[PDB]
């Protein structure tokens with residue numbers, strides 16, 4: 137996360153972190169329930185063998201509320217394309233159930249029509265992760281969050297050098313130095329409504345991080361809710 | 371205006387069925403007796419930052 141603030145105790149309980157063989161976080165994810173993690177498909181080619189850690193806010197030491205979970209089944213969207221990152225969505229079935237507690241809890245999955253009409257028409261959403269704090273910097277050891285405004289669809293298409301498909305939306309700032317970044321991918325994009333947080337996106341990609349005239353690109357969760365429902369039964 | 375007017379007074383999901391407002395809730399919540407508010411059915415309901 138470039139800019140933003142550190143996630144304070146219990147503020148981002150639905151954040152999951154994919155770790156590689158050396159226990160290094162390389163991507164994020166969103167806790168959907170006791171057995172399911174939502175993440176980005178491109179994150180699956182970023183590591184051979186990986187586990188999912190929850191309840192962590194500071195990768196530097198052992199707090200006490202952390203828990204690692206092995207992945208039982210990886211459910212990648214078959215339409216995902218490495219070339220355009222279209223259909224950048226995957227669900228993870230964990231071998232053991234997550235024990236909800238302080239800093240560990242699922243985000244809500246909204247209904248399509250309501251989400252698109254009431255959630256995505258609001259000014260901002262919230263993205264979070266352990267990703268880079270600068271485009272050239274190193275992964276953050278502290279979990280961060282950042283309010284990112286929804287970007288007009290027409291304007292972002294004009295800003296992008298790459299095709300912005302119907303399965304994605306833009307969020308962030310034109311010139312302001314705040315945005316998601318490498319390492320945050322697969323992470324949560326949630327929208328708050330009356331004190332309750334609903335999953336609205338998945339950190340997908342961007343032309344660099346927080347560049348002028350460039351925005352953050354997120355997978356459009358409302359376009360895969362049915363797919364997600366199905367994925368959580370197999 | 372129904373749903374277009376302040377989410378039809380619903381806490382969460384709002385539907386316009388037969389020109390009338392109908393509220394619903396996410397998995398883990400129970401629609402309250404007033405048919406608008408959403409009640410958590412158990413601990414650690416989805417979408418809630420952990421306080422205690």
Ligand SMILES: COc1ccc(-n2nc(C(F)(F)F)c3c2C(=O)N(c2ccc(C4(CN5CCCC5)CC4)cc2)CC3)cc1
Nearest residue numbers: 219220221271298316317318339340341342343344352353
């Ligand atoms: C808001 O969330 C984020 C914002 C930015 C990043 N991010 N940081 C960095 C770095 F730190 F390394 F600068 C990079 C990225 C990134 O997403 N890149 C990228 C990945 C894929 C694509 C393609 C086309 N590609 C496929 C191959 C052909 C060209 C459109 C699909 C275009 C660009 C560049 C490197 C991550 C999350």
Ligand SMILES: [Ca+2]
Nearest residue numbers: 194195197199
């Ligand atoms: Ca820790």
